[PDB]
């Protein structure tokens, strides 16, 4: 066993704060913002052996990663940046930074109580994404 089995699981986003202004503090336009903010994605997260793979599922895009903590790697944002990301679990929280085009973004998952508190940052815009069990 380890720590990180307190995130996995399949994930239901419950409540959403602020995720247009930070859509739009990373450089989302305009028909990408409207489509993306009304997903209700599901996240399905595992781990297997070092390897943590974050599923989102939506009526929007179905997107995939697989990472070891610690390591960069090359994702495809739902928006379609190419980003460089490194993941870390850090006192207990998922630290997940995604540098591109000079710009840095990044994204905080913690559990508090019966939730996975998913917490966004583009420069001083933060949107609070909050997900329970399905
Ligand atoms: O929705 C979240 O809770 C979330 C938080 C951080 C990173 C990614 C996500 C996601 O799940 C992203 C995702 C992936 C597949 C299907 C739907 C969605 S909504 C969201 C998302 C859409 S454009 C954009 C542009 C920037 C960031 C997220 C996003």
């Not at 720590?3 to 202004?21: C, I, P, Q, R, Y």
């Not at 980003?83 to 679990?89: D, G, N, R």
Request: aromatic share 8%; hydrophobic share 35%.
């Amino acid at each position: 066993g380890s720590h990180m089995d307190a995130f996995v699981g399949t994930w239901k986003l419950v409540s959403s704060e602020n995720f247009d202004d930070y859509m739009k503090e990373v450089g989302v336009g305009f028909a990408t913002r409207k489509v993306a903010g009304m997903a209700k994605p599901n996240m399905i997260i595992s781990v297997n052996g070092d390897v943590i793979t974050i599923k989102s599922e939506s009526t929007f895009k179905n997107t995939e990663i697989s990472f070891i903590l610690g390591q960069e790697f090359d994702e495809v944002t739902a928006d379609d940046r190419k980003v460089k990301s490194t993941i870390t679990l850090d006192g207990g929280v998922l630290v997940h930074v995604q540098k591109w085009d000079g710009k840095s973004t990044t994204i905080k998952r913690k559990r508090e109580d019966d939730k996975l508190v998913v917490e966004c940052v583009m420069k001083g815009v933060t949107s609070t994404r909050v997900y329970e069990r399905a």
